[PDB]
Amino acid sequence: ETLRVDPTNDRLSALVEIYRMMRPGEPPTREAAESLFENLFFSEDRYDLS
Amino acid sequence: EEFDAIKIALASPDMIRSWSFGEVKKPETINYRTFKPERDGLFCARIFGPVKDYECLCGKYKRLKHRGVICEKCGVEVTQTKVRRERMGHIELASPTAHIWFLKSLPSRIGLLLDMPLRDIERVLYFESYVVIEGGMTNLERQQILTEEQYLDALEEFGDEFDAKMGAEAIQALLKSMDLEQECEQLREELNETNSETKRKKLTKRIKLLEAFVQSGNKPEWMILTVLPVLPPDLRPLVPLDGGRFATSDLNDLYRRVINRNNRLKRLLDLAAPDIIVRNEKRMLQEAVDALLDNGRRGRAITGSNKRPLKSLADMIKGKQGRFRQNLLGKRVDYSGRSVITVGPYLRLHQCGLPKKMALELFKPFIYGKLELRGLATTIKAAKKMVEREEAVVWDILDEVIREHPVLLNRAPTLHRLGIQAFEPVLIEGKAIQLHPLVCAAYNADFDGDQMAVHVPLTLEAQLEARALMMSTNNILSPANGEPIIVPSQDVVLGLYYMTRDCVNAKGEGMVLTGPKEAERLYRSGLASLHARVKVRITEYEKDANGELVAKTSLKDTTVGRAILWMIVPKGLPYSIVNQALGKKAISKMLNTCYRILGLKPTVIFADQIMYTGFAYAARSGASVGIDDMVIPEKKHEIISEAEAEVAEIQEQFQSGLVTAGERYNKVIDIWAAANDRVSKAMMDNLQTETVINRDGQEEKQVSFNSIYMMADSGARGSAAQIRQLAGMRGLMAKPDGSIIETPITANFREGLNVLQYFISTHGARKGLADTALKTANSGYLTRRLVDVAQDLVVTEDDCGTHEGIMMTPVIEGGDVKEPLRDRVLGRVTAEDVLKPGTADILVPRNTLLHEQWCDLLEENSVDAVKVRSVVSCDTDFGVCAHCYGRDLARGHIINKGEAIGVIAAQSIGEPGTQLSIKLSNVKSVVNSSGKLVITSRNTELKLIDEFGRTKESYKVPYGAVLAKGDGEQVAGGETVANWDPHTMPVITEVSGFVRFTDMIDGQTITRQTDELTGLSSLVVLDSAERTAGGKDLRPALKIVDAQGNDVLIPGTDMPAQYFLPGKAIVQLEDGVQISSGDTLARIPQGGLPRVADLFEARRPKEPAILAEISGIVSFGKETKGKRRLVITPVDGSDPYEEMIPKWRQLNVFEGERVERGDVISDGPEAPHDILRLRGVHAVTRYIVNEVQDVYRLQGVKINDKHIEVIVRQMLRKATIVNAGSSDFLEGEQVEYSRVKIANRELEANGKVGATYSRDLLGITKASLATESFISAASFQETTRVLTEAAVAGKRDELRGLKENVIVGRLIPAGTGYAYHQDRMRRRAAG
Amino acid sequence: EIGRTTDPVRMYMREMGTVELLTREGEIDIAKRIEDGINQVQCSVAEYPEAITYLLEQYDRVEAEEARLSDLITGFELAREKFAELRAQYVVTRDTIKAHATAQEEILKLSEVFKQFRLVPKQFDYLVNSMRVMMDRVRTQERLIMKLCVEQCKMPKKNFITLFTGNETSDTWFNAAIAMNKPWSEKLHDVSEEVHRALQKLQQIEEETGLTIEQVKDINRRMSIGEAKARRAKKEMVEANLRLVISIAKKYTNRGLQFLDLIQEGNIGLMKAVDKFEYRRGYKFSTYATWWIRQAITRSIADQARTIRIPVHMIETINKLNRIS
RNA sequence: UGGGAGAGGUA
Ligand SMILES: [Mg+2]
Ligand SMILES: [Zn+2]
Ligand SMILES: [Zn+2]
C-alpha cells in the first residue's frame, strides 16, 4: 500500500524528494542530493551512537 | 484628561508624520568620548527633547527664565525632560513595506480584501512572482500572478498596455486601484442568486470587512507602512551596568537593523544597483520591519547576541510578561511591607500585631507630618534625620499615628475576596505580623512559614473603605454561601468539645447549683470536673415579637462545661444551642444562630469570647497523642489471615483452570474491599466504645475519651479515613496506570510498613502531589477566565418588574435528597405566589425577600416547588436589578445597588478549584390482560410522593417497561417496583386481535433462521445496509388487525395501526395467533475540574444527543442510503425541516409516534447549544446549574446557585438576528442582546413591526473576546487578534467596565464609585 | 521551485543560482565592453562645445590660484601649455565655424585632442548630468508640443513626425501646418502665442548650444546607448561573482551582524570594485575584488555592530596599545 | 540603583 501511494520512480527522483523535504525552496540537483543523503546518516562525523 | 472614549483606528502616513518631531536618519545612538546624543540618531535631543530639566546640549540656555525656546546652536528645545517619553520620531522607508499584523494574523485582511490567496500574496511580497495591476487587453486580467518567465514573455509581447509590478509596492498600488463601494455592491449582487454554504460565508465575511472600511472611514492603502514611527527613548531606554558596560533594550537593536537596511536601500537606489541586489535589499527591509513589529511571526525569529529571540513591540504588549497583565492591571505599590506571620491569641477580631521597625518604615511621611505639626522639627530634612535616628519622641508620635488607622493584610494567592482584610494595628516588639487565630480560616493560612503583605491606605476615603467595607468584623459570612467563615478551627473546637462532653461518674455527680457562676467556681476550686452530670439553674432570655427580651428560669440536666459556656453565650439564644457536644458543624450553627438572632456586634464578641475559652480549656485539658492511643483492633490478624486464605483459594482455582483471570482479579479486589471494610468497622467500634471501666451505677458503657477519636469526632483535624490509616488497615493502593493493585497494603502506620508497601505507597503520594499542582494552575486559569467574563455586571436598578422566574424544585435525583428546598431557595425573591391549601394556607406576595422565618413557614407547610426571580431572566439593560439577585450573601440582607456581582460570583466559583406513593407523570399507557401495566412513552418519570404532598425520590422508567402499581397506590419500602428489560427494547402495541404479515418476504428484508435452544424459527429483519436490490424500497410492518382482519384504527387518531419495525428485531410472534394489548412483539437490542471547565467553556461533546426541532409525528423519507433521514412533519402544518443521522447510531423514537419540542431522539449527552435553541433559556440555565452543582456536591463544597446563574447570564449576552424589521441590522450579525432589546423597545414604542432574534450560548473564551470592549478583550487574551480587528473596524471604547477603569485609572462603577459614575453619566446626558 | 521557503538568504542563493560562473577569458571581454562603453560616452561628450568652454573656465579658475590642482585633473608646465593651445584652437574655431566641411574636421580634431585630458569622475558626472538637464528642458518642451497637438484637434501623427521633426528652428513648419486646408488648422490660432513662446524658447536653445536640435539629439542618443551598454556590461559583471561575496562573508559571520547584512554590504563593495577595475594588469577579477569586498564587510561590522559605536581609528589604536602593553 | 536571561528555594 505504501508503494502504491509513493509517487517516486527511482533513486534520483527519491533523492530529489528527500532534498525537497529537508531543504525546501532550494533547486535540487544530483550531486547535492547524493551528498545530503550520505552526510545525514552514513557519515562518521555527522552521525554517531558508537 | 477627562475623556469619554478611547477611539482606535488605522494610522495614515500623514497622521504618523503629524505625530513625529523629526526624521531619524542615523543608526548610531550616542557617542563614546562624551556621552551626548547624536544628531538625527535614535536618542537625539533635537527630535526627542532635552536631556536635563531646562537645558540645551551646548550649555547656552540653562534656566527656567528661558522657559521655552529653540537653541540656535544645537537645535535642542529648552523644556523639561519629561518630554523624552512623549515625543516620537519617524523613519522614512524607501520601499513601502507591509504591516505584519494586517497580513499574518488570520484572517489575513489583505487576502480577505483583495480576494487573493495568502500564499500568492506571500509570493508577491517575497519578490518571487510578479502581479499585474491593470491591463487593457483581455489576456491579462486584474490580479493574475505571473512568474518571471511569463512576465518576460508578456514584456516582449505587449510591453505598453499592461503594468505589472512586484513586491509590497505592487500590493499598495493594488489596494489603491481597487474601489471599496464598487466591490461591495458587486458582492451584494453576487450573494443573491445562489447560496452554497462556503461561498455565502466567504462572501458575507468579505462584505462585513468592506462595510467595516466604509463605515469607519479608513482607507485600504493605510495597511502598507510607508512611514514607520519610533518609540520615545525613555520607553526604549539605555540602562547601564555596574561595570561600565551597557545593557540596552532589544528595541534599539531592532530599530538599528531597520535604519541600517533602509539607509542601504537608499544607497542602492542612488548607486544604480543591479535588479537582484536591490530586490534582496527590499526583501531585507521588509523582513526587518516585520521582525520589529512581531519577531516570531513571519519566519525564523531574529535572535540577538546571546542566542535568544529579541523582544519586539508585539512581545512587549502581548503575553504573560506583557504591559497589560504585568503593569496595567497589577502594579507595584508603595507604602507596603512583608513579613512572616505568627499567632496572637490575646488580640481581638479586628487587630493585628505590626512590628515597631516595619511600621516605622511604613508610616514615615505620617510621622513627618506629626513631627512638623508638633514643632519638634523645623524642616523636612530635620524630620527625616529624627526618624532615621529612632528617638523616643518618634516612637511616641508613631504610637499616636498608628492608633485607629487600619492596614490591609493581603496574602497571595488571593483566591476569594476574604484574602484581603483591614485590621486596626497594634504595635508589638518583634519582626512578625501577629494575626488573629480566627481569620486564618478565611486566609487559608497556616503558620508553616507563610508571608503576608501589608498595604497602607492613605486618603480619608480609602481609610473609610477599610473601616466600613473591609474591616475584619464586618465580613464574617462568606460571600460564596451564607455561612460564617470567622469560625473556630481545630483548637477552639477541641477545647469546646472537651468542655461540653460528659463522662458518667467523673467527680461530684448529681449536685444542684445556683447557676453558671457557681459551676465555674466549682471547677476552678477543684471539687468537680468538667464532665460531671449536674443540675444547674439556667436563666435564658427568649426573644419577644418586638426587640424586648422575656426570661424563663428552670432546672436543666446539664454538665459543668455547658454551664461554663453559658457565661459566654449572650442573652437571646436558647439552651439547646449549648446542651450538646460541640463539633465544628455545631459551633458553625451556634455562630449562624447568634448572627440571625442578634446581629453583628453580639456575634463579634461571642466569637472572641468563645475563642478565649476554647484556647484556655484546651490548655487545661492536656489532650496529648501517644502510642497507646492508636489502639489497633485485636481481631486484625484473624480477618487478614482469612482474607489471604480466600484469595489463595481463588488463586488455586484459577491455577486449576476454572475461573478466568479478569474474574479472579475482580473477585480479589472485592474480597479485599470487604476485608478492609470489616477491619475498619472493627477498628471504629473498638476506638469509639472502649471506655467501659466505670462505676456508681454498675459497669457501664460510654463513648471513649481517646484523644485520636476525640480529634476525629470533633471535626478538628482529620477524618475517619485518616484514623483508619493510622489504626486499622491502609487499604487498596492504586498504580499510576489507574488499575488497582491486587494485593493491598495490610500494615498500618503503627505496626510500620515494610519496604515494598512503602514503595507502592510512593506511587499515590507523588501522584497526589503532582495532581495538586496541576489543579491549582487550572483553577487559577479558570478563575481568570471567569472574572474576565463577569467583569461588566453590576447592580443598576432597584427592581425591573418582570414576571419570569426559575421554579426551584429540590434536586431529587437518585435515592436521597441532595439539596433541600432551604438550601435551594433561602435568599431569593419570590416571583409568583404559593397557591396551595396545605394546612395553614401560606400566601407570600411577589417581591418578597425569603427570610429564614418565611423559609421555616415553607418547611412547615411542605411546599413542593416555588418560582423565584433569577439573574438570567432579568430585564434590565447593562446590569441586573437588586430584586432578581436577592440577598447579599456576605451581609445577610438585600443587595445594595451598585455592588459588583460578577467578580464575587467568579471568585466564589473558581476558589474551590484547588480542592476539586406512586405518582406517574407524562404518561400514555393501556391496561393489559394481566394488570402488569406497560408504558408506551419514553419521557415517563416515576415520581415518589409522600402522603403529605412533598416528594421523596425520583426515577425514570424506560419505554415498554412493565409496572405493577397504579396511581394513588402507597407501597411500602424495599418493594422492587422497577422491572424492565435492560438490553432489549420492546415494540409493544395497544390494540388486540390478529396479525397480518404484510410486506416481508424471505430473501430481501428478513433472514430465515431458527433459535438454537427451542427449534422454533425466528424472523430477524435484515438491516438495510446488507439487503439485496429488492429491499431498498420497502419497510416491513407488523400490521396488527382485529380478530377477523379489518384495519383497526388507533382510538383517538386517524392513523392506521401499523408498526414499521427496524432491523435486528427478534420477532418471536408469528402469523395466525392471538395478540393481547400491551404485550411485547419483538426484541430490539441497544473528573470534577475538567467537567466544570467544559461546562463553562460550552463544548459540544464527543457524542451529542439528536433532538427534535419541531413538534409532530416523525417519518422516514429518503431511501437506498444508510444515513437515516427523518421527515418530522407537524400535525397541523407542512414540514420545512429534515435531519441527517449517521449509520451506526441507534434511535430511541420510532416512526409511528409523535414527539414534542425537544425530545431525545438519540440517547447520550446533550449539547448545551441545542438545549438552549430548542428548550429555552431557563432550561439551559437549570442544566448548567445542576451539572455544575453535581460536581461541587461530589467533592463536598457548598456554593449558591446564583453565582452559576450570573456566569450563565454573562454567557448568553449575544443574540443573532434571524429576521429584521426596520432596525439597522441586515442579516446574521452577532449583536448584543441588550442592543436588540433596546431597539425592539424603541420600535414597539413608536409603533413598528420590530425585529426578532435567537440567542446563542457562547463559551467563556468566545464571550470575553466578543465583548464589545477591545481593551477588556486584549487584556484578557489574544491581544494581536483583538487589536487587529479593532483597528480595521475602527471601534471605540465607551469606558463602562471595571477592568477598563482599572486600566485607565478612574473610579470603578462598583460600590463607592457608582454614585460618581452615575453623576457623570447624568452630566453627560444633561448637556 | 517557489515553495514555502522563509529564509531570505536561501531565496537569495536560489535567485543567484540562475547565473553561471566566469571562465578564464570571459571577464577580460566584459571589461573590454565596459571600457568600450566608457570610451563611447567620452567620445560622445567630446564634441560638445559648451563642455569645452566649461573645462577652459575651470582651468582659468585653477590658474587664478584659489582652487587646488587635484579636484579637476588626474593625469594623461605641460597641461598649462596644452590647454593654452586648446584655447588658441578654441578662439580660431569660434570664427572658422562660419566656413562647410572645414567646421566638421576642426571640431573632430578638437574631439580627438580632448581625449588626453584625464578628468576627475565627479566632474564627469557634472558633464553628463548637465547634458541630461538641458535634455530634460528640451524634452518637456517637445512633450509640451506633443501634448498641445493631441489635446485640441485629434489629428493623426504621421504629418507631425514629418513636419515638426525636420529643422524645427524657424517657423517654416507651423505655417505649413496651417496652410493645408484642414478644419482644425483654422482654429490653431489660439494656440499660436504660447507656441511662439515655445519657438523663441527653441531659439534660446540655439544660442546657448550653438548647434541645432538634431545634432544634440544625436549626441545625447549616443550618450544614452553608450551609458546603457556600459551599465549592462557592469551589471553582467556584477551578477557573476556573488559567490565570491558569500565566500568572503562566510568567515565574518558571528561578529555581531547577521549573515545577510554581510553579503549585502559585500555586494556594495563588489559594485565599487567593478566600477574601478583595470584589466591591463593581467589579473582576472578576483585579486582586485577581494580587497574591496573585505573592506566593505570590515567597515560594515566596525560601525553597525554595536550601540556604543567606536570609530575604526580608535579601535585599532586601543588594539595596538593592548598588543604592546 | 533601575534592564534581561539561567539555576535553586518558600507558601
Ligand atoms: Mg502555609
Ligand atoms: Zn544649546
Ligand atoms: Zn430583573
PDB file of C-alpha atoms in Angstrom, chain B residues 656-828:
ATOM      1  CA  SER B 656      -6.546 -25.365  38.149  1.00  0.00           C
ATOM      2  CA  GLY B 657      -8.227 -23.653  35.192  1.00  0.00           C
ATOM      3  CA  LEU B 658     -11.859 -22.887  36.065  1.00  0.00           C
ATOM      4  CA  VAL B 659     -12.254 -19.117  36.562  1.00  0.00           C
ATOM      5  CA  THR B 660     -10.722 -16.584  34.177  1.00  0.00           C
ATOM      6  CA  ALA B 661      -8.070 -14.025  35.084  1.00  0.00           C
ATOM      7  CA  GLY B 662     -10.290 -10.938  34.944  1.00  0.00           C
ATOM      8  CA  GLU B 663     -12.922 -12.516  37.183  1.00  0.00           C
ATOM      9  CA  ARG B 664     -10.161 -13.604  39.588  1.00  0.00           C
ATOM     10  CA  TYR B 665      -8.896 -10.003  39.561  1.00  0.00           C
ATOM     11  CA  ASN B 666     -12.365  -8.575  40.256  1.00  0.00           C
ATOM     12  CA  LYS B 667     -13.018 -11.192  42.971  1.00  0.00           C
ATOM     13  CA  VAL B 668      -9.719 -10.448  44.750  1.00  0.00           C
ATOM     14  CA  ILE B 669     -10.455  -6.697  44.734  1.00  0.00           C
ATOM     15  CA  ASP B 670     -13.990  -7.250  46.069  1.00  0.00           C
ATOM     16  CA  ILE B 671     -12.715  -9.613  48.787  1.00  0.00           C
ATOM     17  CA  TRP B 672     -10.035  -7.159  49.928  1.00  0.00           C
ATOM     18  CA  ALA B 673     -12.573  -4.318  49.869  1.00  0.00           C
ATOM     19  CA  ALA B 674     -14.894  -6.350  52.107  1.00  0.00           C
ATOM     20  CA  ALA B 675     -11.944  -7.251  54.348  1.00  0.00           C
ATOM     21  CA  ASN B 676     -10.876  -3.597  54.573  1.00  0.00           C
ATOM     22  CA  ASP B 677     -14.447  -2.572  55.425  1.00  0.00           C
ATOM     23  CA  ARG B 678     -14.661  -5.220  58.165  1.00  0.00           C
ATOM     24  CA  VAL B 679     -11.298  -4.223  59.679  1.00  0.00           C
ATOM     25  CA  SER B 680     -12.229  -0.522  59.554  1.00  0.00           C
ATOM     26  CA  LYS B 681     -15.598  -1.225  61.191  1.00  0.00           C
ATOM     27  CA  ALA B 682     -13.981  -3.288  63.966  1.00  0.00           C
ATOM     28  CA  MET B 683     -11.369  -0.547  64.443  1.00  0.00           C
ATOM     29  CA  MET B 684     -14.039   2.162  64.665  1.00  0.00           C
ATOM     30  CA  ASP B 685     -16.047   0.072  67.145  1.00  0.00           C
ATOM     31  CA  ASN B 686     -13.043  -0.660  69.388  1.00  0.00           C
ATOM     32  CA  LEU B 687     -11.982   3.009  69.297  1.00  0.00           C
ATOM     33  CA  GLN B 688     -15.410   4.619  69.833  1.00  0.00           C
ATOM     34  CA  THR B 689     -16.624   2.476  72.743  1.00  0.00           C
ATOM     35  CA  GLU B 690     -13.523   1.153  74.533  1.00  0.00           C
ATOM     36  CA  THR B 691     -14.089   3.113  77.766  1.00  0.00           C
ATOM     37  CA  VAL B 692     -16.200   0.636  79.740  1.00  0.00           C
ATOM     38  CA  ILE B 693     -14.424   0.664  83.115  1.00  0.00           C
ATOM     39  CA  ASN B 694     -16.950   2.755  85.065  1.00  0.00           C
ATOM     40  CA  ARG B 695     -18.786   2.782  88.391  1.00  0.00           C
ATOM     41  CA  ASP B 696     -21.544   4.410  90.560  1.00  0.00           C
ATOM     42  CA  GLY B 697     -24.345   2.622  88.759  1.00  0.00           C
ATOM     43  CA  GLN B 698     -22.721  -0.613  87.555  1.00  0.00           C
ATOM     44  CA  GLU B 699     -20.161  -1.488  84.894  1.00  0.00           C
ATOM     45  CA  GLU B 700     -21.477   0.961  82.282  1.00  0.00           C
ATOM     46  CA  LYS B 701     -20.504   1.924  78.742  1.00  0.00           C
ATOM     47  CA  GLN B 702     -19.921   5.304  77.113  1.00  0.00           C
ATOM     48  CA  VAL B 703     -18.043   6.949  74.261  1.00  0.00           C
ATOM     49  CA  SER B 704     -14.279   6.742  74.639  1.00  0.00           C
ATOM     50  CA  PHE B 705     -12.060   9.585  75.832  1.00  0.00           C
ATOM     51  CA  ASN B 706      -9.246   8.557  73.480  1.00  0.00           C
ATOM     52  CA  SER B 707      -7.566  11.621  72.001  1.00  0.00           C
ATOM     53  CA  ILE B 708      -7.317  10.259  68.444  1.00  0.00           C
ATOM     54  CA  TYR B 709     -11.070   9.584  68.453  1.00  0.00           C
ATOM     55  CA  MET B 710     -11.586  12.987  70.127  1.00  0.00           C
ATOM     56  CA  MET B 711      -9.783  14.983  67.425  1.00  0.00           C
ATOM     57  CA  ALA B 712     -11.604  12.874  64.813  1.00  0.00           C
ATOM     58  CA  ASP B 713     -15.139  13.201  66.228  1.00  0.00           C
ATOM     59  CA  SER B 714     -14.724  16.935  66.908  1.00  0.00           C
ATOM     60  CA  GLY B 715     -14.096  17.715  63.250  1.00  0.00           C
ATOM     61  CA  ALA B 716     -10.884  19.396  64.391  1.00  0.00           C
ATOM     62  CA  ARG B 717      -8.100  17.865  62.270  1.00  0.00           C
ATOM     63  CA  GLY B 718      -8.614  14.766  60.149  1.00  0.00           C
ATOM     64  CA  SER B 719     -11.398  12.296  59.470  1.00  0.00           C
ATOM     65  CA  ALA B 720     -12.275   8.597  59.756  1.00  0.00           C
ATOM     66  CA  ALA B 721     -10.168   7.788  56.679  1.00  0.00           C
ATOM     67  CA  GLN B 722      -7.070   9.172  58.432  1.00  0.00           C
ATOM     68  CA  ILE B 723      -7.890   7.243  61.628  1.00  0.00           C
ATOM     69  CA  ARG B 724      -8.342   4.087  59.525  1.00  0.00           C
ATOM     70  CA  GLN B 725      -4.871   4.515  58.008  1.00  0.00           C
ATOM     71  CA  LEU B 726      -3.391   5.074  61.480  1.00  0.00           C
ATOM     72  CA  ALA B 727      -5.007   2.200  63.392  1.00  0.00           C
ATOM     73  CA  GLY B 728      -6.813  -0.165  61.023  1.00  0.00           C
ATOM     74  CA  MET B 729      -5.725  -1.134  57.510  1.00  0.00           C
ATOM     75  CA  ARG B 730      -4.048   1.117  54.949  1.00  0.00           C
ATOM     76  CA  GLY B 731      -6.280  -0.197  52.167  1.00  0.00           C
ATOM     77  CA  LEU B 732      -6.004  -0.798  48.438  1.00  0.00           C
ATOM     78  CA  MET B 733      -3.487   1.490  46.733  1.00  0.00           C
ATOM     79  CA  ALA B 734      -3.618   2.195  43.007  1.00  0.00           C
ATOM     80  CA  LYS B 735      -0.978   2.025  40.293  1.00  0.00           C
ATOM     81  CA  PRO B 736      -0.223   5.124  38.166  1.00  0.00           C
ATOM     82  CA  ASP B 737      -1.882   3.276  35.239  1.00  0.00           C
ATOM     83  CA  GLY B 738      -5.246   3.630  37.013  1.00  0.00           C
ATOM     84  CA  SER B 739      -5.684  -0.067  37.811  1.00  0.00           C
ATOM     85  CA  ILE B 740      -5.933  -1.092  41.459  1.00  0.00           C
ATOM     86  CA  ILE B 741      -3.171  -3.483  42.534  1.00  0.00           C
ATOM     87  CA  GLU B 742      -4.460  -6.886  43.640  1.00  0.00           C
ATOM     88  CA  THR B 743      -2.647  -7.301  46.952  1.00  0.00           C
ATOM     89  CA  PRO B 744      -3.212  -4.338  49.315  1.00  0.00           C
ATOM     90  CA  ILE B 745      -1.059  -2.627  51.947  1.00  0.00           C
ATOM     91  CA  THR B 746      -2.155  -4.604  55.009  1.00  0.00           C
ATOM     92  CA  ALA B 747       0.032  -2.855  57.594  1.00  0.00           C
ATOM     93  CA  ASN B 748      -0.886   0.486  59.148  1.00  0.00           C
ATOM     94  CA  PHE B 749       1.206   3.438  60.335  1.00  0.00           C
ATOM     95  CA  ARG B 750       1.562   1.942  63.836  1.00  0.00           C
ATOM     96  CA  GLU B 751       2.948  -1.509  63.014  1.00  0.00           C
ATOM     97  CA  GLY B 752       5.106   0.101  60.332  1.00  0.00           C
ATOM     98  CA  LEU B 753       5.199  -0.682  56.637  1.00  0.00           C
ATOM     99  CA  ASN B 754       7.824  -2.872  55.040  1.00  0.00           C
ATOM    100  CA  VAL B 755       9.896  -1.865  52.013  1.00  0.00           C
ATOM    101  CA  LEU B 756       7.609  -2.946  49.158  1.00  0.00           C
ATOM    102  CA  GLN B 757       4.477  -1.438  50.736  1.00  0.00           C
ATOM    103  CA  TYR B 758       6.241   1.908  51.157  1.00  0.00           C
ATOM    104  CA  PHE B 759       7.435   1.796  47.537  1.00  0.00           C
ATOM    105  CA  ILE B 760       3.831   1.079  46.496  1.00  0.00           C
ATOM    106  CA  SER B 761       2.565   3.993  48.627  1.00  0.00           C
ATOM    107  CA  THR B 762       5.049   6.395  46.976  1.00  0.00           C
ATOM    108  CA  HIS B 763       3.117   5.987  43.698  1.00  0.00           C
ATOM    109  CA  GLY B 764      -0.072   7.525  45.104  1.00  0.00           C
ATOM    110  CA  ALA B 765       1.786  10.099  47.213  1.00  0.00           C
ATOM    111  CA  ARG B 766       3.749  11.513  44.268  1.00  0.00           C
ATOM    112  CA  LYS B 767       0.638  11.258  42.058  1.00  0.00           C
ATOM    113  CA  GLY B 768      -1.449  13.264  44.541  1.00  0.00           C
ATOM    114  CA  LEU B 769       1.317  15.838  44.944  1.00  0.00           C
ATOM    115  CA  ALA B 770       1.646  16.133  41.133  1.00  0.00           C
ATOM    116  CA  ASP B 771      -2.169  16.318  40.687  1.00  0.00           C
ATOM    117  CA  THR B 772      -2.469  19.128  43.266  1.00  0.00           C
ATOM    118  CA  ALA B 773      -0.043  21.398  41.364  1.00  0.00           C
ATOM    119  CA  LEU B 774      -1.934  20.828  38.065  1.00  0.00           C
ATOM    120  CA  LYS B 775      -5.394  21.640  39.511  1.00  0.00           C
ATOM    121  CA  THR B 776      -4.211  24.898  41.123  1.00  0.00           C
ATOM    122  CA  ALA B 777      -2.829  26.085  37.763  1.00  0.00           C
ATOM    123  CA  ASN B 778      -6.087  25.009  36.070  1.00  0.00           C
ATOM    124  CA  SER B 779      -8.194  26.671  38.792  1.00  0.00           C
ATOM    125  CA  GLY B 780      -6.307  29.956  38.525  1.00  0.00           C
ATOM    126  CA  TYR B 781      -6.647  29.903  34.742  1.00  0.00           C
ATOM    127  CA  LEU B 782     -10.359  29.126  35.187  1.00  0.00           C
ATOM    128  CA  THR B 783     -10.703  31.922  37.765  1.00  0.00           C
ATOM    129  CA  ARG B 784      -9.069  34.466  35.441  1.00  0.00           C
ATOM    130  CA  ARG B 785     -11.341  33.441  32.562  1.00  0.00           C
ATOM    131  CA  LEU B 786     -14.431  33.572  34.822  1.00  0.00           C
ATOM    132  CA  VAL B 787     -13.545  37.048  36.152  1.00  0.00           C
ATOM    133  CA  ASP B 788     -12.855  38.414  32.665  1.00  0.00           C
ATOM    134  CA  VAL B 789     -16.285  37.230  31.515  1.00  0.00           C
ATOM    135  CA  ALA B 790     -18.191  38.516  34.559  1.00  0.00           C
ATOM    136  CA  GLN B 791     -16.411  41.886  34.769  1.00  0.00           C
ATOM    137  CA  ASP B 792     -19.144  44.084  33.269  1.00  0.00           C
ATOM    138  CA  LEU B 793     -22.001  43.036  35.615  1.00  0.00           C
ATOM    139  CA  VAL B 794     -23.142  45.433  38.363  1.00  0.00           C
ATOM    140  CA  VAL B 795     -26.435  46.217  40.078  1.00  0.00           C
ATOM    141  CA  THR B 796     -28.088  49.231  38.441  1.00  0.00           C
ATOM    142  CA  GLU B 797     -31.826  49.192  39.207  1.00  0.00           C
ATOM    143  CA  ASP B 798     -33.800  48.539  42.380  1.00  0.00           C
ATOM    144  CA  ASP B 799     -36.490  46.494  40.583  1.00  0.00           C
ATOM    145  CA  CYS B 800     -37.199  45.651  36.944  1.00  0.00           C
ATOM    146  CA  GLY B 801     -40.799  44.486  37.401  1.00  0.00           C
ATOM    147  CA  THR B 802     -40.612  41.224  35.460  1.00  0.00           C
ATOM    148  CA  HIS B 803     -42.881  38.186  35.761  1.00  0.00           C
ATOM    149  CA  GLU B 804     -40.383  35.461  34.801  1.00  0.00           C
ATOM    150  CA  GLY B 805     -38.511  33.122  37.125  1.00  0.00           C
ATOM    151  CA  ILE B 806     -36.960  29.718  37.659  1.00  0.00           C
ATOM    152  CA  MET B 807     -39.097  27.217  39.572  1.00  0.00           C
ATOM    153  CA  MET B 808     -36.759  25.869  42.259  1.00  0.00           C
ATOM    154  CA  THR B 809     -37.542  22.193  42.874  1.00  0.00           C
ATOM    155  CA  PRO B 810     -35.185  20.339  45.256  1.00  0.00           C
ATOM    156  CA  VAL B 811     -32.785  18.167  43.270  1.00  0.00           C
ATOM    157  CA  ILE B 812     -34.122  14.696  43.914  1.00  0.00           C
ATOM    158  CA  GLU B 813     -32.130  12.523  41.508  1.00  0.00           C
ATOM    159  CA  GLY B 814     -31.417   9.051  42.867  1.00  0.00           C
ATOM    160  CA  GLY B 815     -32.412   7.616  46.228  1.00  0.00           C
ATOM    161  CA  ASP B 816     -31.750  10.579  48.533  1.00  0.00           C
ATOM    162  CA  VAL B 817     -32.275  14.319  48.930  1.00  0.00           C
ATOM    163  CA  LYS B 818     -29.207  16.087  47.537  1.00  0.00           C
ATOM    164  CA  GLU B 819     -30.183  19.661  48.403  1.00  0.00           C
ATOM    165  CA  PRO B 820     -33.277  20.564  50.445  1.00  0.00           C
ATOM    166  CA  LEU B 821     -35.564  23.433  49.497  1.00  0.00           C
ATOM    167  CA  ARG B 822     -33.992  25.520  52.283  1.00  0.00           C
ATOM    168  CA  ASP B 823     -30.510  25.393  50.735  1.00  0.00           C
ATOM    169  CA  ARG B 824     -32.026  25.920  47.270  1.00  0.00           C
ATOM    170  CA  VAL B 825     -34.228  28.997  47.879  1.00  0.00           C
ATOM    171  CA  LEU B 826     -33.067  30.811  51.088  1.00  0.00           C
ATOM    172  CA  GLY B 827     -32.203  34.331  49.977  1.00  0.00           C
ATOM    173  CA  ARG B 828     -34.022  34.847  46.699  1.00  0.00           C
TER     174      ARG B 828
END
